[PDB]
Amino acid sequence: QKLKCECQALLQVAKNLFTHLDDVSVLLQEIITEARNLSNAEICSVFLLDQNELVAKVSYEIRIPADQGIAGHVATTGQILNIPDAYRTRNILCFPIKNENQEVIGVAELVNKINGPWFSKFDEDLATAFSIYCGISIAHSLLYKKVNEAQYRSHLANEMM
Amino acid sequence: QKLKCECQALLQVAKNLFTHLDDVSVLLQEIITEARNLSNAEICSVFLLDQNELVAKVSYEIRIPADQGIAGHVATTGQILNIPDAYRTRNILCFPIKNENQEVIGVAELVNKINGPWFSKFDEDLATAFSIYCGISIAHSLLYKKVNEAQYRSHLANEMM
Amino acid sequence: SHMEETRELQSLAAAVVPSAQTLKITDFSFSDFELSDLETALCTIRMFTDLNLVQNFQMKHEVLCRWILSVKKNYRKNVAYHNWRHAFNTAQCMFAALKAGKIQNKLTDLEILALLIAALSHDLDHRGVNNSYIQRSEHPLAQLYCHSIMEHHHFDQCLMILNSPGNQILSGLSIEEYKTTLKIIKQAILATDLALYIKRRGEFFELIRKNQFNLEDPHQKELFLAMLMTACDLSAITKPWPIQQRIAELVATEFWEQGDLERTVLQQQPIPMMDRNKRDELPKLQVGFIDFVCTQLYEALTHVSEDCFPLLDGCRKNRQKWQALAEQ
């Protein structure tokens, strides 16, 4: 019933994010926009694990080691993890960014649901499905930018010959 | 009822072809498979225009100038164009490959429908929507390949310095 | 006939153009195995491009690009290598010497102009014919001159074709720049011939070996220009072995076709190199050539010109590798 619409939300995030590979920054614009529009969370922050430390632009950087913290505990685990009572923060959906795998490429956390003051178990797995398209968009757009910068700087080194 | 599936088949071709950017050949495998599965055509061939001439692997190449031919006339136009009576070929859905635009990047042609011996007007626009995902996959995976080969051969020129 | 060649003109007007920095031409041991005559013409556009000659001499755009394509079509197609590709490798050596070698800090841009135009006019409209063949097959061009008749004809067609329509890159030149241009190009095209190079080279090496060479002593400098000219005229040998196989076994087969002319319309008792029978002994007779002009010139081109050292090294790598084919 309403059931189709949140699948077509995945349609929207797909047809969007797969067309935004040209730049990860604009990709962040579209992602933050679509997420603040659909997740109903008043705010959010997206960690990205690196060996033993998470990385997040929320463009001032924010950092937190995989051993330390609760979201860091999610970095240790990759568990989707609702926090219906946060302690106007009042709840947090702390789930891994993921991508190709359940392996922790990062740790997203939504804050302050619209419709139902608490995050539901419904406010979990759907965010993970959204994080399928987002995770592919991240891993592959970064896959794009790394090849860009590196292989471009290579011909920058080509200079003398 | 039955009326809600074919779009999610576009979800299938999306989740497929957008994940197969790493190589064009595999992209052709998934495309030929998904197309011979969904189009109900017994066979097909996909032209790709270059200024004034179409290009097709159907891996022996096949070529036809944009001015010459009926499919070439489609290259001249980009009109979707059913041929219910082909003259076990008996019909041809000749529609442009397209991509970002109605501009003729190429000219696909499906052959021999299952369910209803003729191609329908239904056997037109759906092929175009399928050609949205396929056209983006082509333009952008080839966009990926050109960057690969060119920027790689650049560091191959970097070798002396 | 022309309809197809101008279809190739639309190939210029409608095809992907890989960048020169992608196309390894700045590398001296470059892979010309994959380039078409069109793409090599494009690299020739680069050769007119980066030498800062267009800005310094006001060359026309498409008049230059089709200078390049017109020279691309004027070569008779019966020729095996001494065609547009030969000009491609020669002015590849010239463009690379004047950019990768960074000689511009030394010698003047006027001289860069003379070097480039004479490099692309080292062998204009070459018919698979050297000086000797016309000197003995008696083509009218032979009686038209005496010494280095192909190259006196290459200066003749320098001053002619550049003044001929579709080729007026000399049009932007000032009368002084123009004078230094066609004159230094005169002496240099005379030296584009390996022979008049052998004539002029000794003063150069005497002025090079002692590290006493000076560019505020201009005749020595122009003589260096000629030395780079002859360094460029035979640059095809600098190319990689899988490809060089093609290049110098086409030196083999093309001097075996010109040599077929040497044993049909000439009928000499065969000389050891161009005899086809030396198919597995020809490369040694290339080495003795390489020792006689190549390495002898690229040593001085090593001790003065610098990053041009691989232009020597990229030749020497072929030596034993051809000796292998020369070792039956």
Next chain:
Amino acid sequence: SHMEETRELQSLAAAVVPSAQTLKITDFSFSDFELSDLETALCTIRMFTDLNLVQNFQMKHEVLCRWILSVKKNYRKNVAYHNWRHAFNTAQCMFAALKAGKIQNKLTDLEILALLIAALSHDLDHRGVNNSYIQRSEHPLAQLYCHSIMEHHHFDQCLMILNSPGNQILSGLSIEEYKTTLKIIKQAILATDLALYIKRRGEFFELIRKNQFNLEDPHQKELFLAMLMTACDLSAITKPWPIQQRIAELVATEFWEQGDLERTVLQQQPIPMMDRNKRDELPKLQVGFIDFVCTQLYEALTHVSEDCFPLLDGCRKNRQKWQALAEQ
């Protein structure tokens, strides 16, 4: 203290590693502005890598990589430029000279080894201190030697640290290769000092200017090794102006901290260069230094070593560009 440095060791164990071909180090005027000490250490791994030494001398793997990181941590952190980055530019010049310069076709791999290890031991554990400072500030190392005391200490720490744990890359060497190694490195580290270079250089230039240099006359060849050594010891000047600003104004400020030591623990009447007052006239005093060693050495390093020409050119580009700051 060490816990953080070994956290940097996990930065070695957990960070993206740009390729040397991506990191322009083959380009002599490379941008070391963005490299970290870790990434420069990685380029140093390249410097031990491509010189065909590990295959010819059986160097241990991580013992070498942490040879590089240990020499990285050992520099006192109070020092401005004369730290690991100094070794980075020096062995950048060395690695580039022996690969991009393609000298390996000439000189033996033994000599490549001596050149490289002496290049990275041109200035081991440099304390922001040149020979003269300890000669007058009287650090015990000064009384430990006499001539070129920092560099006699760099040979001392060559033979010591390479025999010290975590640094035994000499372990795979054969006794002959090892002998030629530490000995030629002895004379070369003596010549890594710009001074004993000024001592040894004249025989070299006399043997170079006439193009009579020969590598089958080994002492001359080793002397060339030393010339390349000194060519490498000051290679930081080769870098680009936005960067070179940092590098030679840290030559300014670091010889102004060392010069603060020259006017506190030494209290000499100031000399024009290391006096801070000449911030607007220091660069000319670099040129009088630069002409004294750089260009004089890179001219011969031009006429013999070849592709190494930009190592000269990449210095000369700074001249007027610093004259600007030398022109207030």
Next chain:
Amino acid sequence: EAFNHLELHELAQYGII
């Protein structure tokens, strides 16, 4: 194209003329 006699036979067996 007059040149050294040592060169002439070489000219008669190398790529020059």
Next chain:
Amino acid sequence: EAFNHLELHELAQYGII
């Protein structure tokens, strides 16, 4: 570090020693 006197002041006011 004995050297030529022309060199010495050029050692005494430049980067070397």
